[PDB]
Amino acid sequence: EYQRAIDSIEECLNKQLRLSSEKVDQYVLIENWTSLVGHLKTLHSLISNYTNGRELQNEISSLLKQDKELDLQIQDCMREMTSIYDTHLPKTQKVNAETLLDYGRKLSKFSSA
Amino acid sequence: AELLSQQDFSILQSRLLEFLASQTASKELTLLRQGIRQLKEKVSKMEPEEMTVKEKKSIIEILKARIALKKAFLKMALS
Amino acid sequence: TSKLYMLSESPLSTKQILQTLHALNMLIRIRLSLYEIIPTPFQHFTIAN
Amino acid sequence: RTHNRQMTETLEKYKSLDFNMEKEGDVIQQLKSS
Amino acid sequence: QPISAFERTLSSKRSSCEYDHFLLLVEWHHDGIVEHVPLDDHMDAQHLL
Q1: Is the CB of E5 less than 8 angstroms away from the CB of B51?
Q2: How does it assemble (chain D)?
C-alpha cells in the first residue's frame, strides 16, 4: 500500500501544478492540498508502523537468541549429569596352575604351526 | 544513503513545505521531485516481510515468559 | 559367523533384566533430552517401564 | 575410585531431592509468576 | 496446512515445526462456488450431512 500512498502524493502534486497554471479557484486548490495532507498522514502512520514492527522484530531476534542459549545451558547440565553417571548394560571358577600348565603345554604343539 | 526511517519522512514533509513557500519552472520543485523519486525507489526496493505485528507482541511476551522460567529453573538446580 | 549364529546361555537373570530395563529407560531419557528433533505434539512424553 | 568421587560430588552439587514433585512444579509456577 | 511464519519462529528444539503436518477438512461444492467448512472432531457423518 506504500506505493499507492506515494503515487497518490505525486498525483496530488501534479494536479496542483496543473490547477495553478490554469487558473486560481481557492476551493479546488485548498481541497487538493488537504487531500494530499491526509494521504501524507496515512503514509506516516504506516511508516512509523513499519519501523515499529521492525524494531520489535529485532528485539525478537535478540530474545530468540537468549532462548536458544538457555536451551543449550539445560543441554549442558543434563549432558554432564548423564556423562558422570555412565550408563552400562548389565553383564551378559578358580584354577589350579598345575593342571593349567600341563594342558597348555599339551595344546602348545597343536595350536602351533 | 538508503534506509527507510522516520527521518527521511520528515525530510519529505520539509521539502513539501519549502516548495509551497517558494511558489514557470522551479528549482525547489525539482528538489522535491528528486526526493519523491528517492522515496519511490526506497519503496520499490522495499520487501513486504510481514508477520502479524499483534502476533509479534504476543510472542515477545510468551517468549519472555519462557526466559524467566528458564532462569528460574536453572537457579533452582544451582541452589 | 560364530557371533551371528552364537546364542547365549539360556539363563536370564530377572533381577538383571530389571536392571537392563532401568538402564534402558534411563538411556532413552538420555537420548531424548539430547535427541535433536521432537515434534511439538510429542513434547510431553512418559519414560515408562 | 575416581568415577565414584566424581559421582558423589556431582550428586552433591545438584542435590535437590524430593517426592511428590507435582506440588513443587506448581509451586515453581507461582514462584515464576512472582 | 502450511506452517505459520510465526509458528515457525516460535518452534525450537523439542517443540519443532519441522514435522510435516496436515489436517483433515471438508469443502462443500455449490453451483459455481466452494466453501471450506470447519469439521468438529466429533462429527457423525449424518450430523455433517
Answers
A1: yes
A2: Component of the Mediator complex.
